[PDB]
């Protein structure tokens, strides 16, 4: 079963009821240009 | 639960026969939830938002 | 055209009097 | 009383001479089942529906009659109805006494 | 004086005694059911109601032991679905392919245990046992072999009905929960039995055929036959009455109706 | 449990967290909560009041750099001391 | 084959139509069987989707093979059971034909 | 049309392997017997 | 005491003699003198049986407390309880007396098999001869005591060798078993409490009322106290009753009670100690287990009540397993689904095992299916058919797979 | 409630219907029982505490059987009758057990062992004896309608040879002749109860 | 009915007779806690309903002193006598539903044939009724 793995959002603060910076996720690199075809 | 039985099956036992029905009666229920998938739709990307 | 006859089918009074 | 009537567009017709019915459903009771049957909702009082004179399909005049809302709790679903200024029937809820049983009451003597 | 018993988590002070089937109910969370019904008897066939103590190995039925003494009991426990998917394989082993033709088929409740959870597949790979009907009345459309032995029917006749014309015969297999002898049935709870009965073995010859269930809207409101003012649900489908079904309240019918209303 | 069930990376989950703490912190004048949906999906909460500064900043560079709205949506629900249920992707 | 009609009113090509075409009403044969009494459908709001294709345990409805049946008033598009069944007459080669082509993948 | 005959329980299916309608367990031989859709009585 | 089941057979084990002293108006010390005896139950249960009777011992509550053997004798392999009743009633009279001033029970119905009808006649004489001597009802063989005897006939129903159904049984109602937790030692009978035994536990009473509880607990194993009939049938020289002590080895006891084994061959084979027990393969069977129930336990198998299936393998196993479930879907009422349907599953296949026609992923799925059925069923009748299978399948796996393929080139 | 004392007197009288047939060492029309049969039930209703009368149905349908040796639905509403229970329980139990037979049965109804330890005593060149001699397929019964053959479940005579019992009499160390020769003093008109070792 | 119950006699007899403690059933009433007095509508017509309301009623007043459609709705507002003895005969009688009562006698008819009939089956009152 799959639809039965399925579990309620895990929830963080709930403000309702050092320390160093970070990254939603590590950027991404650019592109490598085409290779074969580099322009057009 | 999701996937309606082949027709060669549907037709040669009981639990086959039963969510072929029900999935066309009632139809499968969903977590309930919401989400935002988007995809390279060829104009753009395509959004679906849905609860 | 209109298919599976009728509904109510309601009576109606007696041809003798009284 | 937050009224607003003005702002929906909807026929005086229809706010007037009509009355929502707020009810928490009964249970089916073919069914031993018992999810549906909790939550509020706020079915709307039937109208005419007659019949068509082609093909026999039972063509309708009402503007709203499936029309039907689920709740969380009474009073929300009340004040709801009076913030659109609507009648109401307000109904309670009925949910069965609780009994005792006993596999072996059944072999007193 | 009412004991402790911990609902797989939080703590409840049930009332003593009390089937845990009843402690569930209780909290809320619905085990799965048959054969057991309120308003009627406990019975311990149909052991689909199976549920796992929280440390005892073995599952007991869910209707039959009372609540003691600060009881946890995990009902969505791994072992308690292995259970119920083990059972249910054994009730859909026979029950005939009739879905479509089952008048029951909109809301039977056999449909519903099978979805929430049966497993999908089938495993069984042999031949149904099937029977021939017996006769019953100008009301009540026997079918039998979509019969699955909750006796309930008979609990129904002998402890509402009164009359015990009705009843089981024979045994494992072959076993029926039609009566013996062509002997037809009559009595004026006879028609309630047309909501009782789980499946589509038994149901209404009058409105037979004539609608499915998620088509008719369900009106309430109470009876005129009787001043005695039991309260329904009318189901209609679209401009037309389609069939009638008890509304249950405590000071009145109890999800019983007569029957010259029904 | 593996060919039907999508695996559900723990990395992205923890990622999102994180970084739901992150701006929990930064400016908790207005940030109800911080869910995230299991399947990696963020998700804070704001006072209606709140709109613009939050959004504002949500452009503005510390990582919250998220340009372009992918949508407006606007969920509503009978229930509640207030209906409608207005909510901003991306 | 044996001339007798498929359909069994289970009703549920109703109750998967997403444009609700089909209406069906239902009464008891004086055999006893399960029958239709005014099966219907209208090509004025059916979409073409095939799901009632799909969806028939007695595999009776079936979307014909033709195509063109275009026609000068609405009145006629309304089909009524009896137009059916002279559409199921007219192909019935044919379609069982496709059917026999295409099952296995079903 | 005519019944088949039986001794007793016995399949139907209208005869469409896989396009017949969906298998059933008719239970008569000298009794008139059945049926789904198929009208394969078994009379015999 | 085969001999002579008149009272001047019971002479022979020397009468009732101080049965009389025995009767000290308080069961207590000969409730202790069970208990001390570490008998455990002979129905299979395997209950601690003091224990098990102690459970009556409240005040009273003032409904009248009765007693009930479950005197039937049925199970494939088992023909212990026959001769037994055929030739020495009284032994058991007496333990019937002992053991309902053990409840200090009103009255002792005992149900039989309706085959038994000739020895429930002569059980009936013997009995009356008992009333004869004033042995029983008002004052009973002196100690001035009230005791009031019955034995009912059956009607081939072996579910109601099982307890429970038993007394449901005997109220008219069919032979199906209540659900727990209510217990004769709860509600038994009509709504009055009672109890149930079997045959052995019983008729043996009293002599632990005489001789030594203790010198009963000398005998087998500590846990696996005392002595119990073992009968010897399948492939064996001279298939009998024998009662001997528990701690015996299988091999030992066949090869000098039973006349011994056919051959070398069926030591290498399955053999089934009772029935509802599982076949267990070595040629080191005995070789490993003892005949006393704990270390059957050991092998993963209960006693079966001590009756004994010799399998040579002239005969194919899988036949007899067939035939053996057969005998299990012919019976089990089947008012729980589980057994009612699983039973008369399991019978399904094993007919196309026989057949060989199978395909072999099947078996697997029915070492599964075993599984649903093996805690489920209401009754031990579902469990007791479940298990021979599953050893089945634990073992002679070959001889199915390749009965299967050899089939295949068909 | 109330209860039942005992009466060693009437015992003896409980003893006749043990042994009505002595040890030896349908239209719903139409029914009624012999005044004796009266006397035996009454005294072995005797045997049930007085608050529950319902416990005596099964031994009364026991000699009906005896009587008419087979068991007429009217026979069922006349016992039903008498202890005033719904005719349907009675069929409940009628139906329930094997001893009981709806259908008539031979004058000699064979039942024979069937489980496994007779077949691996080889109970099958038994079945196959006494059918090589009637010519009766199972449960058929013999158109003289004396015989009515059938294959029977564990008997309990387990440790005993093959085994067959006519109408309550076990017989034992069967050899495929001997049941014969048994048949032929059926015909003779008398039988022991006898192993043949 | 289904179930074991104790059956008495006729009217005036069992009932005045126990209302006056003569039968031994009144004592059982006596010591009974919170007696039920079951009075069916059908017995009240029966020639003399009246009496037998008298009767009851007093088995009513002896516990309390030992101690230890279209019917109801219209008693509610006060419809009485509700029965047709009224009459003196009443020219232009207004039926609502003659389908029941006009099985009895269409005797006001002869002076006065004219019967409105407001029913909703042509059943009994519909034929005997103008308008
Ligand atoms: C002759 C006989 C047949 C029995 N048959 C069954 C049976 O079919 N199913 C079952 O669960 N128990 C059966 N039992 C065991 C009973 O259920 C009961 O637990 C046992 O007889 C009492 O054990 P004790 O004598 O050791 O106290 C049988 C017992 C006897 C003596
Ligand atoms: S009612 Fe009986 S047959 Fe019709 S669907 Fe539910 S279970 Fe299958
Ligand atoms: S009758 Fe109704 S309840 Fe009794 S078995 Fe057949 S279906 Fe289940
Ligand atoms: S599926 Fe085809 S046959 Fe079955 S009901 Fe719907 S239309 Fe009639
Ligand atoms: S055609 Fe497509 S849409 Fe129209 S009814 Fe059949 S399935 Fe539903
Ligand atoms: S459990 Fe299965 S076998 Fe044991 S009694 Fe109940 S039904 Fe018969
Ligand atoms: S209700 Fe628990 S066993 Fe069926
Ligand atoms: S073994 Fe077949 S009867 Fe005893």
């Given at each position: 079963d799959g639809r039965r793995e399925a579990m309620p959002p895990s929830i963080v603060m709930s403000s309702q009821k050092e320390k160093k910076a970070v990254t939603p996720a590590p950027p991404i690199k650019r592109w490598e240009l085409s290779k074969d075809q580099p322009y057009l | 639960k999701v996937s309606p039985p082949k027709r060669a099956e549907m037709k040669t036992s009981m639990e086959s026969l039963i969510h072929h029905f029900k999935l066309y009666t009632e139809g499968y229920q969903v977590p309930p939830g919401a989400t935002y998938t988007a995809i390279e739709a060829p104009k753009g990307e395509f959004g679906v938002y849905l609860v | 055209y209109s298919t599976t006859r009728k509904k109510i089918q309601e009576w109606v009074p007696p041809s003798t009097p009284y | 009383?937050?009224?607003?009537?003005?702002?929906?567009?909807?026929?005086?017709?229809?706010?007037?001479?009509?009355?929502?019915?707020?009810?928490?459903?009964?249970?089916?009771?073919?069914?031993?089942?018992?999810?549906?049957?909790?939550?509020?909702?706020?079915?709307?009082?039937?109208?005419?529906?007659?019949?068509?004179?082609?093909?026999?399909?039972?063509?309708?005049?009402?503007?709203?009659?499936?029309?039907?809302?689920?709740?969380?709790?009474?009073?929300?679903?009340?004040?709801?109805?009076?913030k659109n200024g609507w009648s109401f029937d307000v109904e309670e809820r009925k949910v069965p006494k609780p009994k005792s049983k006993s596999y072996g009451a059944n072999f007193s003597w | 004086n009412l004991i402790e018993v911990f609902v797989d988590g939080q703590s409840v002070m049930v009332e003593p005694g009390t089937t845990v089937l009843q402690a569930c109910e209780k909290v809320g969370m619905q085990i799965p059911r048959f054969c057991y019904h309120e308003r009627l008897s406990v019975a311990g066939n149909c052991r689909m109601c199976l549920v796992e103590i929280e440390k005892a190995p073995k599952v007991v039925a869910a209707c039959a032991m009372p609540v003691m003494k600060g009881w946890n009991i995990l009902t969505n426990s791994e072992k308690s679905k292995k259970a119920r998917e083990g059972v249910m394989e054994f009730l859909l082993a026979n029950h005939p392919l009739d879905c479509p033709i089952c008048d029951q088929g909109g809301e039977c409740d056999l449909q519903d245990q099978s979805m929430m959870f049966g497993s999908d597949r089938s495993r069984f790979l042999e031949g149904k046992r099937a029977v021939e009907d017996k006769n019953?009345?100008?009301?009540?459309?026997?079918?039998?072999?979509?019969?699955?032995?909750?006796?309930?029917?008979?609990?129904?006749?002998?402890?509402?009905?009164?009359?015990?014309?009705?009843?089981?015969?024979?045994?494992?297999?072959?076993?029926?929960?039609?009566?013996?002898?062509?002997?037809?049935?009559?009595?004026?709870?006879?028609?309630?039995?047309?909501?009782?009965?789980?499946?589509?073995?038994?149901?209404?010859?009058?409105?037979?055929?004539?609608?499915?269930?998620?088509?008719?809207?369900?009106?309430?409101?109470?009876?005129?036959?009787?001043?005695?003012?039991?309260?329904?649900?009318?189901?209609?489908?679209?401009?037309?009455?389609?069939?009638?079904?008890?509304?249950?309240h405590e000071d009145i019918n109890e999800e019983w109706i007569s029957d010259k209303t029904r | 449990?593996?060919?039907?069930?999508?695996?559900?990376?723990?990395?992205?989950?923890?990622?999102?967290?994180?970084?739901?703490?992150?701006?929990?912190?930064?400016?908790?004048?207005?940030?109800?909560?911080?869910?995230?949906?299991?399947?990696?999906?963020?998700?804070?909460?704001?006072?209606?009041?709140?709109?613009?500064?939050?959004?504002?900043?949500?452009?503005?560079?510390?990582?919250?750099?998220?340009?372009?709205?992918?949508?407006?949506?606007?969920?509503d629900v009978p229930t509640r001391q207030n209906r409608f249920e207005i909510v901003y992707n991306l | 084959p044996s001339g007798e009609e498929r359909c069994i009113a289970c009703k549920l090509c109703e109750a998967v139509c997403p444009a609700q075409a089909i209406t069906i009403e239902a009464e008891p044969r004086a055999d006893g069987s399960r029958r239709t009494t005014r099966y219907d459908i209208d090509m004025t709001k059916c979409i073409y989707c095939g799901f009632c294709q799909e969806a028939c345990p007695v595999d009776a409805i079936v979307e014909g093979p033709n195509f063109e049946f275009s026609t000068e008033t609405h009145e006629e598009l309304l089909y009524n059971k009896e137009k059916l069944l002279n559409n199921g007459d007219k192909w019935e080669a044919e379609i069982a034909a496709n059917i026999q082509a295409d099952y296995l993948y079903r | 049309p005519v019944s088949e005959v039986g001794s007793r329980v016995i399949s139907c299916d209208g005869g469409g392997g896989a396009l017949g309608h969906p298998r059933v367990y008719i239970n008569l031989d000298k009794e008139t017997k059945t049926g789904t859709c198929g009208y394969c009585g078994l009379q015999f | 005491g085969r001999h002579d089941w008149r009272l001047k057979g019971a002479q022979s084990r020397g009468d009732w003699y101080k049965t009389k002293e025995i009767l000290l108006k308080g069961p207590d010390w000969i409730l202790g003198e069970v208990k001390t005896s570490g008998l455990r139950g002979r129905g299979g249960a395997g209950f601690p049986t003091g224990l098990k009777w102690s459970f009556m011992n409240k005040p009273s509550d003032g409904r009248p407390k009765y007693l009930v053997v479950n005197a039937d004798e049925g199970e494939p392999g088992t023909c212990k309880d026959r001769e037994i009743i055929r030739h020495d009633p009284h032994k058991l009279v007496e333990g019937c007396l002992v053991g309902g001033r053990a409840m200090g029970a009103r009255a002792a119905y005992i149900y039989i098999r309706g085959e038994f009808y000739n020895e429930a006649s002569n059980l009936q004489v013997a009995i009356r001869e008992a009333y004869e001597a004033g042995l029983i009802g008002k004052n009973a063989c002196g100690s001035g005591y009230d005791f009031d005897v019955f034995v009912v006939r059956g009607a081939g129903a072996?579910?109601?060798?099982?307890?429970?159904?038993?007394?449901?049984?005997?109220?008219?109602?069919?032979?199906?078993?209540?659900?727990?937790?209510?217990?004769?030692?709860?509600?038994?009978?009509?709504?009055?409490?009672?109890?149930?035994?079997?045959?052995?536990?019983?008729?043996?009473?009293?002599?632990?009322?005489?001789?030594?509880?203790?010198?009963?607990?000398?005998?087998?194993?500590?846990?696996?106290?005392?002595?119990?009939?073992?009968?010897?049938?399948?492939?064996?020289?001279?298939?009998?009753?024998?009662?001997?002590?528990?701690?015996?080895?299988?091999?030992?006891?066949?090869?000098?009670?039973?006349?011994?084994?056919?051959?070398?061959?069926?030591?290498?084979?399955?053999?089934?100690?009772?029935?509802?027990?599982?076949?267990?393969?070595?040629?080191?069977?005995?070789?490993?287990?003892?005949?006393?129930?704990?270390?059957?336990?050991?092998?993963?198998?209960?006693?079966?009540?001590?009756?004994?299936?010799?399998?040579?393998?002239?005969?194919?196993?899988?036949?007899?397993?067939?035939?053996?479930?057969?005998?299990?879907?012919?019976?089990?009422?089947?008012?729980?689904?589980?057994?009612?349907?699983?039973?008369?599953?399991?019978?399904?296949?094993?007919?196309?095992?026989?057949?060989?026609?199978?395909?072999?992923?099947?078996?697997?799925?029915?070492?599964?299916?075993?599984?649903?059925?093996?805690?489920?069923?209401?009754?031990?009748?579902?469990?007791?058919?479940?298990?021979?299978?599953?050893?089945?399948?634990?073992?002679?796996?070959?001889?199915?797979?390749?009965?299967?393929?050899?089939?295949?080139?068909? | 409630x109330x209860x039942x004392x005992x009466x060693x007197x009437x015992x003896x009288x409980x003893x006749x219907x043990x042994x009505x047939x002595x040890x030896x060492x349908n239209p719903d029309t139409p029914f009624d029982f012999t005044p004796e049969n009266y006397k035996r039930i009454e005294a072995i209703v005797k045997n049930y505490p007085?608050?529950?009368?319902?416990?005596?149905?099964?031994?009364?349908?026991?000699?009906?059987?005896?009587?008419?040796?087979?068991?007429?639905?009217?026979?069922?509403?006349?016992?039903?009758?008498?202890?005033?229970?719904?005719?349907?329980?009675?069929?409940?139990?009628?139906?329930?057990?094997?001893?009981?037979?709806?259908?008539?049965?031979?004058?000699?109804?064979?039942?024979?062992?069937?489980?496994?330890?007779?077949?691996?005593?080889?109970?099958?060149?038994?079945?196959?004896?006494?059918?090589?001699?009637?010519?009766?397929?199972?449960?058929?019964?013999?158109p003289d309608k004396l015989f009515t053959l059938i294959e029977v479940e564990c008997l309990g005579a387990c440790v005993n040879a093959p085994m067959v019992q006519i109408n309550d009499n076990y017989y034992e160390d069967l050899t495929p002749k001997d049941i014969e020769e048994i048949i032929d003093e059926l015909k003779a008109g008398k039988i022991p109860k006898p192993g043949p070792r | 009915l289904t179930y074991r119950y104790d059956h008495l006699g006729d009217s005036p007899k069992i009932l005045q007779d126990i209302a006056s403690g003569?039968?031994?059933?009144?004592?059982?009433?006596?010591?009974?806690?919170?007696?039920?007095?079951?009075?069916?509508?059908?017995?009240?017509?029966?020639?003399?309903?009246?009496?037998?309301?008298?009767?009851?009623?007093?088995?009513?007043?002896?516990?309390?002193?030992?101690?230890?459609?279209?019917?109801?709705?219209?008693?509610?507002?006060?419809?009485?006598?509700?029965?047709?003895?009224?009459?003196?005969?009443?020219?232009?009688?207004?039926?609502?539903?003659?389908?029941?009562?006009?099985?009895?006698?269409?005797?006001?008819?002869?002076?006065?044939?004219?019967?409105?009939?407001?029913?909703?089956?042509?059943?009994?009152?519909?034929?005997?009724?103008?308008?």
């Open positions: - | - | - | 009383k937050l009224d607003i009537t003005t702002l929906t567009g909807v026929p005086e017709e229809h706010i007037k001479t009509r009355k929502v019915r707020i009810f928490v459903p009964a249970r089916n009771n073919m069914q031993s089942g018992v999810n549906n049957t909790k939550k509020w909702k706020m079915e709307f009082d039937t109208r005419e529906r007659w019949e068509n004179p082609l093909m026999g399909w039972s063509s309708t005049a009402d503007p709203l009659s499936n029309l039907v809302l689920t709740f969380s709790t009474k009073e929300d679903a009340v004040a709801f109805a009076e | 019953i009345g100008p009301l009540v459309k026997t079918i039998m072999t979509r019969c699955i032995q909750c006796t309930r029917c008979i609990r129904f006749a002998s402890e509402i009905a009164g009359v015990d014309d009705l009843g089981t015969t024979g045994r494992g297999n072959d076993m029926q929960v039609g009566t013996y002898i062509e002997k037809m049935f009559m009595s004026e709870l006879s028609g309630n039995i047309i909501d009782i009965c789980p499946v589509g073995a038994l149901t209404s010859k009058p409105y037979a055929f004539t609608a499915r269930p998620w088509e008719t809207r369900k009106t309430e409101s109470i009876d005129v036959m009787d001043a005695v003012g039991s309260n329904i649900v009318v189901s209609t489908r679209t401009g037309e009455v389609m069939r009638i079904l008890p509304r249950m | 449990t593996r060919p039907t069930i999508r695996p559900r990376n723990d990395v992205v989950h923890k990622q999102l967290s994180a970084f739901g703490q992150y701006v929990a912190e930064i400016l908790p004048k207005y940030v109800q909560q911080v869910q995230v949906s299991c399947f990696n999906e963020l998700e804070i909460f704001i006072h209606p009041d709140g709109v613009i500064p939050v959004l504002t900043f949500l452009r503005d560079h510390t990582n919250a750099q998220f340009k372009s709205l992918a949508d407006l949506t606007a969920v | - | - | 072996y579910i109601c060798g099982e307890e429970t159904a038993l007394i449901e049984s005997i109220e008219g109602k069919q032979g199906k078993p209540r659900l727990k937790p209510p217990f004769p030692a709860d509600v038994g009978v009509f709504g009055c409490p009672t109890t149930v035994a079997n045959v052995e536990t019983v008729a043996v009473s009293p002599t632990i009322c005489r001789r030594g509880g203790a010198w009963f607990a000398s005998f087998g194993r500590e846990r696996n106290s005392g002595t119990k009939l073992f009968n010897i049938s399948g492939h064996v020289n001279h298939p009998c009753t024998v009662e001997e002590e528990m701690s015996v080895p299988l091999k030992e006891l066949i090869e000098k009670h039973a006349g011994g084994v056919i051959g070398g061959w069926d030591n290498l084979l399955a053999v089934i100690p009772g029935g509802s027990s599982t076949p267990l393969i070595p040629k080191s069977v005995c070789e490993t287990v003892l005949m006393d129930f704990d270390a059957l336990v050991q092998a993963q198998t209960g006693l079966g009540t001590a009756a004994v299936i010799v399998m040579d393998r002239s005969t194919d196993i899988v036949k007899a397993i067939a035939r053996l479930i057969e005998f299990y879907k012919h019976e089990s009422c089947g008012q729980c689904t589980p057994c009612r349907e699983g039973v008369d599953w399991m019978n399904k296949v094993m007919a196309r095992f026989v057949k060989g026609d199978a395909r072999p992923a099947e078996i697997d799925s029915l070492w599964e299916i075993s599984k649903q059925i093996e805690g489920h069923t209401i009754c031990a009748l579902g469990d007791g058919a479940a298990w021979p299978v599953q050893g089945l399948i634990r073992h002679f796996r070959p001889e199915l797979e390749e009965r299967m393929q050899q089939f295949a080139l068909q | 007085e608050g529950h009368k319902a416990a005596a149905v099964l031994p009364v349908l026991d000699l009906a059987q005896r009587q008419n040796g087979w068991l007429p639905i009217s026979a069922m509403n006349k016992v039903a009758e008498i202890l005033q229970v719904p005719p349907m329980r009675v069929y409940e139990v009628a139906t329930f057990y094997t001893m009981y037979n709806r259908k008539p049965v031979g004058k000699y109804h064979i039942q024979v062992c069937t489980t496994t330890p007779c077949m691996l005593r080889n109970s099958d060149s038994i079945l196959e004896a006494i059918q090589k001699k009637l010519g009766i397929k199972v449960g058929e019964t013999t | 003569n039968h031994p059933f009144s004592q059982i009433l006596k010591e009974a806690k919170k007696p039920m007095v079951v009075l069916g509508s059908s017995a009240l017509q029966r020639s003399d309903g009246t009496a037998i309301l008298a009767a009851v009623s007093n088995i009513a007043q002896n516990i309390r002193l030992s101690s230890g459609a279209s019917q109801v709705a219209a008693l509610d507002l006060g419809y009485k006598p509700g029965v047709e003895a009224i009459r003196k005969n009443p020219p232009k009688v207004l039926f609502l539903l003659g389908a029941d009562g006009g099985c009895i006698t269409r005797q006001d008819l002869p002076k006065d044939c004219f019967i409105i009939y407001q029913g909703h089956h042509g059943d009994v009152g519909a034929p005997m009724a103008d308008v």
